[PDB]
């Protein structure tokens with residue numbers, strides 16, 4: 001194999017540890033020679049053997065090299081950013097790689113920024129006619145104006161892994177939920193809580209001609225699909241294909257591919273939906289989905305006949321056929 | 327407080343030369359010690375004396391240092407990207423500066439990326455209830471479907487300075503218009519042309535919650551506000567305050583601030599509008615407006631009591647305010 005890939009994991013967002021878990025899964029299956037670079041929680045980079053050491057430790061609070069790191073970029077044919085959340089999944093790292101001129105996996109600057117913002121992505125989806133849950137944006141230090149009645153879900157606008165998210169039952173509890181959310185972002189969303197709800201997820205793979213995996217369903221005992229439920233082995237019930245009538249599954253895949261085109265994604269996405277009283281809502285799109293042992297995206301494509309090494313090989317090829325097209 | 331500013335100008339977009347002219351304006355009025363760095367048209371950087379030489383020449387086709395440059399970033403307290411268009415105004419350079427950790431002037435990654443894309447920004451604004459002209463996007467290689475009558479304006483979705491824009495009067499000319507646009511972007515927009523039309527502009531200054539300048543109106547003799555009209559001395563007249571009914575000036579300023587807040591813009595924008603048959607349309611936001619001798623943003627704020635050195639002072643201060 002002449003191909004050489006640079007995997008970047010870790011990061012400064014609250015999903016630092018999740019990103020390192022995703023790295024273990026990708027490195028276990030990727031069929032190209034791949035080097036790891038870790039972004040420690042302080043923003044400094046660990047390279048070579050120190051990055052592997054940090055991987056085993058499953059967290060890297062302190063790094064060695066201030067950005068930009070002394071990394072030999074010219075050794076790598078493709079860069080694979082596996083950095084969930086702010087400063088990784090939101091276009092920041094993508095902007096750096098664009099300036100380096102390196103082919104890289106996944107969505108570009110604008111689609112990455114847009115899909116990380118739960119307010120702006122919903123505006124664009126709603127404008128395209130995609131159903132989304134009623135919501136309002138709230139900015140820090142500005143009084144909330146919620147045209148609908150609780151229960152609410154309150155989120156930092158740029159969150160992942162359910163960090164900073166509250167299920168809010170009483171309006172009295174809103175200001176506490178917003179204040180938690182504002183620990184992670186200057187902007188929060190307040191959404192109408194669907195209850196009861198089923199949670200459906202579908203993977204997409206492609207640049208211009210996205211293709212959808214089978215639909216999967218998540219079930220759990222907790223009050224919502226929270227951080228502990230997402231990453232504690234065994235806690236989440238991952239059902240593939242979703243135990244749903246085939247027509248609803250078809251509508252979910254159609255909506256996912258529509259949203260992928262509307263939001264301008266490339267490389268990959270995991271698209272999350274809610275199903276409530278027969279109605280589908282697109283919840284969000286994640287441009288760098290998790291690859292942890294409890295993550296849906298590699299499992300969805302496995303069920304669709306795309307094995308884990310093949311899935312990773314296709315992501316790397318799509319990175320190269322995007323760049324060549326310019 | 328000590329304050330040393332690093333100004334970056336030039337860039338790889340078609341607004342390269344415009345950006346160097348903006349740099350001349352900024353350097354003439356900025357009240358802080360400021361060094362220039364130039365991105366040449368080939369993407370390589372010029373530092374120190376070679377950057378000032380590039381600036382004097384008003385164009386830098388070739389640079390010295392491949393990205394990322396050996397620039398002594400620690401010497402600067404604030405970075406001021408003055409790079410108009412693709413790879414300077416669209417979030418890419420902002421993403422690098424975010425990872426560098428330095429305060430920097432103007433909109434962040436997401437607001438920069440969205441305001442540069444004429445299709446995406448119209449989607450968001452239209453959803454938020456801001457009036458915008460009818461439009462469609464066209465991807466390179468796909469057949470356009472334009473569901474309204476000509477005339478049209480055809481544009482690269484990422485353009486600035488009117489580069490690659492055509493007024494299309496008949497369907498037979500659409501193909502040539504789109505081929506022109508696709509030299510500059512993989513996505514084009516086709517908009518319903520308003521005709522006749524008046525053009526209004528408002529400056530915004532601030533972080534997310536902005537303050538609006540007076541409204542200015544641009545007049546010119548050319549068929550539209552094109553590259554030559556924009557940058558040739560005397561071709562464009564700025565009427566400030568614009569001749570509007572009082573309800574209309576207020577509506578323009580409210581719409582600008584609403585769009586600014588929805589998009590989450592920081593630092594500055596110049597927000598452009600159309601007025602046709604008494605109806606307002608928001609045309610675009612520019613997060614790195616021009617500072618050339620014929621540019622409107624410094625004049626809009628001059629008319630609202632904010633002189634040029636004070637405008638630049640507030641932009642640098644806003645960058646630090648956000649960073650803290």
Ligand SMILES: Nc1ncnc2c1ncn2[C@@H]1O[C@H](COP(=O)(O)OP(=O)(O)OP(=O)(O)O)[C@@H](O)[C@H]1O
Nearest residue numbers: 133153159160161162163191192193194224225286
């Ligand atoms: N409007 C809602 N109604 C019901 N449940 C919700 C709603 N919004 C969020 N949730 C619950 O919170 C979970 C996380 O919300 P969301 O998908 O917005 O967060 P995330 O942090 O972006 O997720 P991921 O880790 O997939 O990136 C959902 O899986 C669901 O359990």
Ligand SMILES: Nc1ncnc2c1ncn2[C@@H]1O[C@H](COP(=O)(O)OP(=O)(O)OP(=O)(O)O)[C@@H](O)[C@H]1O
Nearest residue numbers: 459479485486487488489517518519520523550551
């Ligand atoms: N829909 C339209 N109807 C009428 N005139 C138009 C329309 N779109 C563009 N124009 C004309 O084309 C000019 C440039 O359009 P636009 O503002 O979209 O380009 P830009 O390159 O982003 O401008 P800037 O240099 O201000 O960034 C307008 O100022 C106007 O003269």
Ligand SMILES: [Mg+2]
Nearest residue numbers: 160161284286
């Ligand atoms: Mg998410």
Ligand SMILES: [Mg+2]
Nearest residue numbers: 272283284286
């Ligand atoms: Mg989710």
Ligand SMILES: [Mg+2]
Nearest residue numbers: 485486610612
């Ligand atoms: Mg513009």
Ligand SMILES: [Mg+2]
Nearest residue numbers: 598609610612
């Ligand atoms: Mg304009």
Ligand SMILES: [Rb+]
Nearest residue numbers: 115116285286
């Ligand atoms: Rb997301």
Ligand SMILES: [Rb+]
Nearest residue numbers: 134135136137
């Ligand atoms: Rb809304």
Ligand SMILES: [Rb+]
Nearest residue numbers: 441442611612
């Ligand atoms: Rb713009």
Ligand SMILES: [Rb+]
Nearest residue numbers: 460461462463
């Ligand atoms: Rb449209």
